[PDB]
Amino acid sequence: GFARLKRSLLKTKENLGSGFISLFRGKKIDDDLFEELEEQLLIADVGVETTRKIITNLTEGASRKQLRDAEALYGLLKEEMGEILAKVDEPLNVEGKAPFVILMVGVNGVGKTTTIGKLARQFEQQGKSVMLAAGDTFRAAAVEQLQVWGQRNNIPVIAQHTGADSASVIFDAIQAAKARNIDVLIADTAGRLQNKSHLMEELKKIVRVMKKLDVEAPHEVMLTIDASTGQNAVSQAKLFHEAVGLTGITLTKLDGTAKGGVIFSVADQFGIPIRYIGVGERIEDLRPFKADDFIEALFAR
Ligand SMILES: Nc1nc2c(ncn2[C@@H]2O[C@H](COP(=O)(O)OP(=O)(O)CP(=O)(O)O)[C@@H](O)[C@H]2O)c(=O)[nH]1
Ligand SMILES: [Mg+2]
Ligand SMILES: [Mg+2]
Ligand SMILES: [Mg+2]
């Protein structure tokens, strides 16, 4: 089963899930074993804090159960790591708002633009009207691409001149979305990390201005991060989380990367729902995140 997802996690499975079998085979449970396991989790980009938690709970569970063979740790690890992802297994529900405003945050180069386009198409397939806001106002090329895409796919794009105030662009977009009975408004934002302080104050301004029109907006603050960037995805998540209230995460480029274990670090460190995972370039390759599917593909024997 899960043949499709297993293939997309092939490189990650070398170090996590089924990758543990060869590590445990024929060994006993002792300090050396747990030190080996810790190393492999760290190599898999699981993170120091989340790895220590896994080792601590795994050590205690094996001791009180009086386990002897390392192979017996496999089931406890699947449950421990499965729980981490189950805590952030909540699909995004955009129903019942006029419009549902998704504030897309993240740095450049992690797949934010692609995710906007794929989400827009998916919502249209679900019977919804979609509108986009080009809030990345100082990157003329980024604004131009989004406008070209909207005209390709017959989706309205709200944009202003290069250098316009991003909060004002998104304000006008909410007004236009409400006036045109739009179901979902997807607002792009800047992704330049030169000067953390400024970008973060820019996002807080965008949120403040939104609530002039709708105290519920933004209904979703979605971070996009790139699984192939390893711990950079975690530092980026911490940055945007502390600055603005993240409510969802999309993790792209799980396919073809050996660093897919970062998802456990992102899940455990922040507890923010992971809404989608990217496992390909097709529109449908942006899949809703299902913790059970992911664990089963990872730990399948
Ligand atoms: N293998 C893979 N590629 C993906 C995935 N999601 C997006 N991509 C691809 O990664 C590349 C970057 O996507 P993009 O949306 O442009 O990121 P960006 O931050 O907007 C780039 P810029 O800063 O110039 O605007 C693209 O080629 C995109 O098709 C994914 O889930 N898996
Ligand atoms: Mg050792
Ligand atoms: Mg080891
Ligand atoms: Mg872009």
Q: From which experimental method does this structure derive?
A: X-ray
Pairwise CA distance, residues 123 & 286, whole Å: 12
* Residues flanking ligand 1, CB < 6 Å: 108-114, 142, 252-253, 255-256, 278, 280-281
Enumerate domains of the chain plus CATH numbers.
Answer: 3-87 (1.20.120.140), 100-299 (3.40.50.300)
Pairwise CA distance, residues 68 & 33, whole Å: 11
Backbone dihedral region for residue 125 (phi beyond 0: left; psi -120 to 50: alpha; all else: beta): alpha
286-288: strand order across its sheet = 157-158, 130-133, 184-187, 100-105, 220-226, 248-252, 274-278, 286-288
- CB-proximal residues (5 Å) to ion ligand 2: 35
Pairwise CA distance, residues 69 & 26, whole Å: 7
Q: Kindly report the number of other CB atoms within 10 A of residue 183's CB atom.
A: 20
49 Cα to the center of ligand 2, angstroms: 18
Six-digit token string for 97: 């708002």
Question: 11: exposed, middle or buried (C-beta count within 10 Å: 0-12, 13-18, 19+)?
Answer: middle
Phi, psi of 141 (to 5 degrees): -65, -40
184-213 burial, b for 16+ CB within 10 Å, e for fewer? bbbbbbbbeeeeeeebbebbeebbebbeee
Six-digit token string for 132: 């986009």
The residue written with tokens 């006029």 in the block is: 98
Q: Which ligand is nearest to the CA of 36?
A: 3
Task: Say which residues have a Cβ less than 8 Å from residue 243's Cβ, sequence separation at least 6.
Answer: 196, 199, 200, 203, 204
Spatial CA neighbour of 287 closest among 177, 172, 122: 122
The residue written with tokens 């249209």 in the block is: 124
Question: 147: exposed, middle or buried (C-beta count within 10 Å: 0-12, 13-18, 19+)?
Answer: middle
Six-digit token string for 123: 């919502």
Dihedral (CA of 25, 27, 31, 32) sign = negative
Question: Does residue 117 have a known ligand-binding role?
Answer: no
Question: Does residue 176 have a known ligand-binding role?
Answer: no
Phi, psi of 26 (to 5 degrees): 75, 5
- According to DSSP, the residues that pair with 158 across neighbouring strands are 133
Pairwise CA distance, residues 266 & 289, whole Å: 13
Spatial CA neighbour of 295 closest among 44, 62, 24, 75: 75
Spatial CA neighbour of 29 closest among 4, 9, 50, 59: 59
3 state SS for the chain? CCHHHHHHCHHHHCCCCCHHHHHHCCCECCHHHHHHHHHHHHHCCCCHHHHHHHHHHHHHHHHHCCCCEHHHHHHHHHHHHHHHHHCCCCCCCCCCCCCEEEEEECCCCCCHHHHHHHHHHHHHHCCCCEEEECCCCCCHHHHHHHHHHHHHHCCCEECCCCCCCHHHHHHHHHHHHHHCCCCEEEECCCCCCCCHHHHHHHHHHHHHHHHHHCCCCCCEEEEEEEHHHCHHHHHHHHHHHHHCCCCEEEEECCCCCCCCCHHHHHHHHHCCCEEEEECCCCHHHEEECCHHHHHHHHHCC
Question: Does residue 111 have a known ligand-binding role?
Answer: yes
- According to DSSP, the residues that pair with 185 across neighbouring strands are 101, 131
